[PDB]
């Protein structure tokens, strides 16, 4: 298939992997830090999603160095995914407008 759609689907798959891996690693990094709340997996998965989408309610946040590094990877995976999809959409619309005008 076309490259922009392959890249978008790839990025969605990788994003799902980053969300799951980041949830696991966030708990691993944050347990052992007194006061940390990112310490059970279901709510860590929720936190990783609202971090990837850049919503960040602030109901949960990492306090350790490694938990925050994981957060940064999650943010960047989410923003990159969303950028990839926007660009793929733009590419589709541009090509269909080229055809509709007769190139």
């Amino acid at each position: 298939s076309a490259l922009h759609w392959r890249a978008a689907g790839a990025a969605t798959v990788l994003l799902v992997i980053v969300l799951l891996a980041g949830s696991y690693l966030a708990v691993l990094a944050e347990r052992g830090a007194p006061g940390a709340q990112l310490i059970t997996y279901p709510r860590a998965l929720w936190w990783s999603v609202e971090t990837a989408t850049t919503v960040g309610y602030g109901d949960l946040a990492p306090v350790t160095l490694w938990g925050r590094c994981v957060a940064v990877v999650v943010m960047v995976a989410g923003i990159t995914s969303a950028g990839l999809v926007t660009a793929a959409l733009a590419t589709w619309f541009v090509g269909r407008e080229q055809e509709r005008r007769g190139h």
Partner: antibody
Amino acid sequence: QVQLQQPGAELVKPGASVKLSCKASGYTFTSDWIHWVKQRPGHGLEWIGEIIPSYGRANYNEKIQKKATLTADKSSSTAFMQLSSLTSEDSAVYYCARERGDGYFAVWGAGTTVTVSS
Amino acid sequence: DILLTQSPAILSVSPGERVSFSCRASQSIGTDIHWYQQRTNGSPRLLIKYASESISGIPSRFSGSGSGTDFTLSINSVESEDIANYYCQQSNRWPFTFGSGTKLEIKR
């Protein structure tokens, strides 16, 4: 099928050390944590520490003097707690417990009664 | 660290009455409180998770309520086998902590 198997008793000379075991069966996940809880006779439950066998990382109760070292053998599904240089204040039942990463102790071992005496 | 206060330490009831155990957290912890029963020479047994959620195999006369800082374990119509110590435990912040326990005693 007992999910967590612990020896009934350990006798330890004052100053000596002992390795408690906790053999796990049943469903095992990468999100499992094994916890260790100390109970002095007639007293409450004191959290000692935890280990995630899928990764080998262990954390310890900071409020108490560190007498424990937690390890886990993934091939024999066994968690260990090495207690070192014990005194009579270390005489207690020590439980292991399995937490599926969601915060509560779904199942407990039967406890190992450790007596520190000569 | 989250301090969990269980008071009173001893509860005295009559057979078949409703009993309520109190557990108070030193700061707000949502519903992240779990309740265990420990009989004489027995190991603890989970009764209620996340403040109010049932556990399979636990009699239905056990229930829990509350959120924030104030939690209650309830027994509808207590009977002899409920004689035990009862502990709450929080999982909202590291480290997990336990309350100091309430003993149930029955006046027969």
